From a paper:
The protein is separated into three domains: An N-terminal cytoplasmic GTPase domain (G-domain), a helical domain (together with the G-domain termed ‘[name]’), and a C-terminal polytopic membrane-spanning domain. While the import of Fe2+ by [name] is dependent upon GTP hydrolysis by the G-domain, the mechanism of coupling between the two events is unknown. Like other small G-proteins, the G-domain of [name] undergoes significant structural rearrangement in response to nucleotide binding and hydrolysis. Recently, it was shown that the rate of nucleotide hydrolysis and conformational switching by [name] is accelerated in the presence of potassium ions, and the protein has been classified as a member of the potassium-activated TrmE-Era-EngA-YihA-Septin-like (TEES) superfamily of G-proteins.
Crystals were obtained in space group P212121 with two molecules in the asymmetric unit, and the crystals diffracted to a resolution of 2.5 Å. The transition-state structure shows the canonical G-protein domain fold (residues 1–170) interacting with the helical domain (residues 171–270). Conversion of the GTP substrate to its transition-state causes Switch II, and the adjacent portion of the helical domain, to shift away from the nucleotide binding site. Switch I, however, remains locked its active conformation, capping the nucleotide in the same orientation observed in the mGMPPNP-bound structure. The potassium ion lies at the nucleotide binding site between the G1 P-loop and the apex of Switch I. The ligands for the potassium ion are the backbone carbonyls of Gly29 and Trp31, the sidechain amide oxygen of Asn11, one oxygen each from the β- and γ-phosphates, and one fluorine atom from the transition state analogue. The bond lengths about the potassium are long, up to 3.2 Å, which is necessitated by the strict geometric constraints imposed by the protein and the nucleotide ligands. In this way, a binding site is created which is selective for potassium rather than sodium – a smaller ion that prefers significantly shorter metal-oxygen bond lengths. In its magnesium-bound conformation, the backbone carbonyl of Thr35 hydrogen-bonds with the attacking water molecule, which is also the recipient of another hydrogen bond from the backbone amide from Gly56 from the G3 motif. Therefore, this supports the results from the current study, which suggests that water alignment in NFeoBSt is achieved only via hydrogen-bonding interactions with the backbone amides from Thr35 and Gly56, the conserved glycine residue from the G3 motif.
Author numbering: 1 to 257
Amino acid sequence: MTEIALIGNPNSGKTSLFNLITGHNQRVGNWPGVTVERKSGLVKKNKDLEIQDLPGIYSMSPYSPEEKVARDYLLSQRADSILNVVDATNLERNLYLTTQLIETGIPVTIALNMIDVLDGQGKKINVDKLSYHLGVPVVATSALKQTGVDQVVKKAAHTTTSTVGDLAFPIYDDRLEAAISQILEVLGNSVPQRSARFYAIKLFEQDSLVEAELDLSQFQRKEIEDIIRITEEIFTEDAESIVINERYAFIERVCQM
Ligand SMILES: Nc1nc2c(ncn2[C@@H]2O[C@H](COP(=O)(O)OP(=O)(O)O)[C@@H](O)[C@H]2O)c(=O)[nH]1
Ligand code: ALF
Ligand SMILES: [K+]
Ligand SMILES: [Mg+2]
């Protein structure tokens, strides 16, 4: 059983796609926060695949307990594949979560949803260019028009932890990359090897939840803290700002193409 997880911002159309894929009639509403818990189902056209509908999430640093459900599912390493549902009308903001999903080490396939609205707004995105610069497969989809749904399930099924070798993580400012490497060595075996980069960046971000979940040694805590301090002076900017800016700068470079 291949495990595919529907991850994306709230109101991106995850349940709409789920319902089409599974034949289900799970709750779909035109406001953020309808889906509040996990729901599994089998892919109608390919019964070997199990797909998970999860609540909308703005980032892997959750604000509400509903956002925690999606995060915990991915970090528990249950999912073989991340089907990242992206709102094409709000691309830049949706990609902020995308950068974090890749970092989890679970291969990401993008469903570039609501392509119909984008067509009605008189705009077009070079799908192949976006896919190449992002390092992940991209299929333009519409849940309304029922466009590209089967194709994106197909690709997600072929982009799992079992079929993908080395992954293409988003590369940031080289000065931050040095800090990430050092934290990766400090971390050693305190985290899964697959998700190591995700945790390393979140520890640099001083994410309270990650810090508590990992329960790192006093020696590890001192060295990370030292790595952050030095990198802050190099960047002449606070740790949270460095990462936030570096994600959006990466997003900027990808979108212009
Ligand atoms: N126009 C258009 N609307 C969509 C599309 N996908 C979903 N929707 C609509 O987007 C809203 C959000 O749907 P939903 O599945 O609840 O989003 P979710 O919170 O990610 O599960 C609903 O009003 C759907 O009718 C799409 O591809 N095109
Ligand atoms: F905002 Al939702 F499922 F209702 F992501
Ligand atoms: K919704
Ligand atoms: Mg939903």
